Amino acid sequence: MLQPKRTKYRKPHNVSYEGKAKGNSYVAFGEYGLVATKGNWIDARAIESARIAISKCLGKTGKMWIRIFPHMSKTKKPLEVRMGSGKGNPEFWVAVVKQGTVMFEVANIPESQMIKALTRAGHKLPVTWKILKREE
Amino acid sequence: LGIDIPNQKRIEIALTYIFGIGLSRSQAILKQANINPDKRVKDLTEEEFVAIRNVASAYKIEGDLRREIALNIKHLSEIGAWRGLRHRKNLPVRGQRTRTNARTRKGPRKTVANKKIE
Amino acid sequence: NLKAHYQKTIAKELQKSFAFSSIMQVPRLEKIVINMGVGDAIRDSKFLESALNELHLISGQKPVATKAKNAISTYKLRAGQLIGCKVTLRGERMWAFLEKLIYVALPRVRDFRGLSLKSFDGRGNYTIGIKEQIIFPEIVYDDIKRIRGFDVTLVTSTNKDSEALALLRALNLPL
Amino acid sequence: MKTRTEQRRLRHKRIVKKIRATNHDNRVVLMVIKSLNHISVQAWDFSQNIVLASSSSLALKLKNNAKLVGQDIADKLVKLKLTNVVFDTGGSKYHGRIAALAEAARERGLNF
């Protein structure tokens, strides 16, 4: 899906997925921002679903920027495997999201549509959502 | 300009080696000056070489003739006409009919197939 | 001597024309370099010795050939395989080469349409390319079959090349 | 890149670094500079980083070849009672007047 077309190493480390935030502690481009209240990994399927839903309910009248991206890939060995004999096999690409980070910032449309879109995207993402309003 | 001569043969034909000056002006100048070109020798001396070249430059210069023909062709092709498009695509302009003739500018004969019939 | 006339007249003329308050701000030509480049045979058309020998004959300095600084992809040329020649000359040989060029080379050109409009790099360097092997007063017609041109460059102690144009104009240069 | 003088400074620096590092014996280095008008010589003993002796053609002579500019400082060396120096060529080559001053140092029984 939406992922780098090249990568030097097939098998990276899992993720150092604990912690609160490493950058992106603020809304930058949009007017309403989504805040994650859980740190885990999100696959590209849900990300694509949320992006399509947001583009459907918003269009190009406004604009929403995504501050995260599936920079990582993951491996998962198939069933009926005896422990050992090499590592697993790559399956997909994933994005780590830490509790207290921003990933969607939307602007150029009234506030109610922003709130509705953020609620719909949050109910599409596994992570529990929080809303933030941009201020200068 | 001063070095285009075959070795050890008549100067009157040796002068025509330049791309743009033929046997007419060369012989006309030569017999007007009455130099009596030598037989089977590349050249006699250079006492008149500069003079012969100065006199020949009066007619025209072959290298300058290259530019003259180039600008003539360019100006002929710039103006919207059958001549310009005909010369642009390198085809015979003089009106001769062409079916499979005039095979000097079209390169080698090139064909693949045609319409068959049973 | 062209060099004597230069150093006795042109330096003072340029000092009077361009205010310097110092007799050594006038641009002075340092050296000339000659190189050809060979790309007709893999390692031997005439073994390149013809051009080296004629340059040796025409110049007072021994010719030398450069090595392959870069790996060549078009042809199998790596780690040497000398192509072209290199001669860096100064002193009286420089002036001899200059006077051959200003009175024989350009006059021996079949047709000329002027020069010295943009032959600069913007940093005080000038260049001349010649398309004929037999253009010099010292060259034999019997040589390598293919006629070969040459490239030379001129540089001074400064980079204000406008004054170089003015000086060369004072030294028999087409405009 | 090269001013014909700063490159001399760098060459002299690398030579004295070589002397300092490769030679671990306590010895004063006789550094000689070949100026375009005359020649100067100085002495530098490490572990103190000061000058022990010096000579040139300003306070002792007028111009250059003359070997005198050696003996005096050579005398200065025997006035220091060490006579064990390492001869630095500086930004020059051992030849001509450099060899002349080396011979002048040798004839005074200096160890180098």
Added chain:
Amino acid sequence: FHFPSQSVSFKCASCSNSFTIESTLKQKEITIDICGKCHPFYIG
């Protein structure tokens, strides 16, 4: 050390002038059809 060098005169009879710093080392006072004094872009 090098090829035997020398100094020979040059002569442009077309422009009727002679100059001398160096020339070909095996011939004396070679002749040319045109020089820098008869240059087509310097004569008024």
Added chain:
Amino acid sequence: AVKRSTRLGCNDCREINYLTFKNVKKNPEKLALNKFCSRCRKVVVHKEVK
């Protein structure tokens, strides 16, 4: 895996001094070294052998 061995030995007493290597591909030529010799107790030219 490769065999480059050659034995440099003295000539005045025919010793077997030093085992060394030299590429036969570049040149199959004898190399005359100058090294120390015990039975001569001095630096002499050693020659190569199989």
Added chain:
RNA sequence: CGGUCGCCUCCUAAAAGGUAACGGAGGCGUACAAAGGUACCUUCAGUACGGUUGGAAAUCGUAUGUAGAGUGUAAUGGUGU
């Protein structure tokens, strides 16, 4: 049944070191009378510019360029007179 059985570089591997798998990666059964030692002197890769053959890349000239070549080589570290 399959893979390996020895040697060496990096991460795993807990800021010395040490430290597992049928972990992730990689190379090895070398080369060399020169790619050795010593003395001499010399210092980038590249980019832009200007040039007959002559290419995005041939060589030179002018600079800028501070590590982005090279120091046999799979890798590491160091390596800018």
Added chain:
RNA sequence: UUUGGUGCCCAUGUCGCUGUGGAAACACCUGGUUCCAUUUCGAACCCAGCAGUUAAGCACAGUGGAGCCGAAUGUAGCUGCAGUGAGAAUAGGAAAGCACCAAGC
């Protein structure tokens, strides 16, 4: 007092600009039979002389142009729910300095 060299320290030392002066010196410069020499040449090295030079490099004053260093709070991190102290950003700094000899003091 400065100038010349020198190591020391290898940027808060750098690369750049505006002016200053070289009379003694340093530098350029004058040339290349010869000491020596050019991967190729008085390019470079080297010989013997200072006609001219403050223009080139050398420096001194300014230039915060670029490069570069970097205050505190808070904060990341952690050792038992307190301590510990960050980095980055930020005020800003930023036109080297320390010794020896030598000439004019």
Added chain:
RNA sequence: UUGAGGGCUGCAAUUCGUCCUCAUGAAGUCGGAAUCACUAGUAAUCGCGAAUCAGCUAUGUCGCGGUGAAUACGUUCUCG
């Protein structure tokens, strides 16, 4: 072939006339299968006239005249 200048035809020459002069001189150093022609003025070859006619690179056609060959053993194989 390309380009320039003169001259002619016809009301008119760009589509598409022609001639001359001048500038250039593509290829080609006898061509593979197939093969046409004629038994003496013959082949081959050097020229001229008529036609269509304002113009007509038709080297075409109809003729004219000059110079002037080779072989023929054969009908077995090729065609009728």
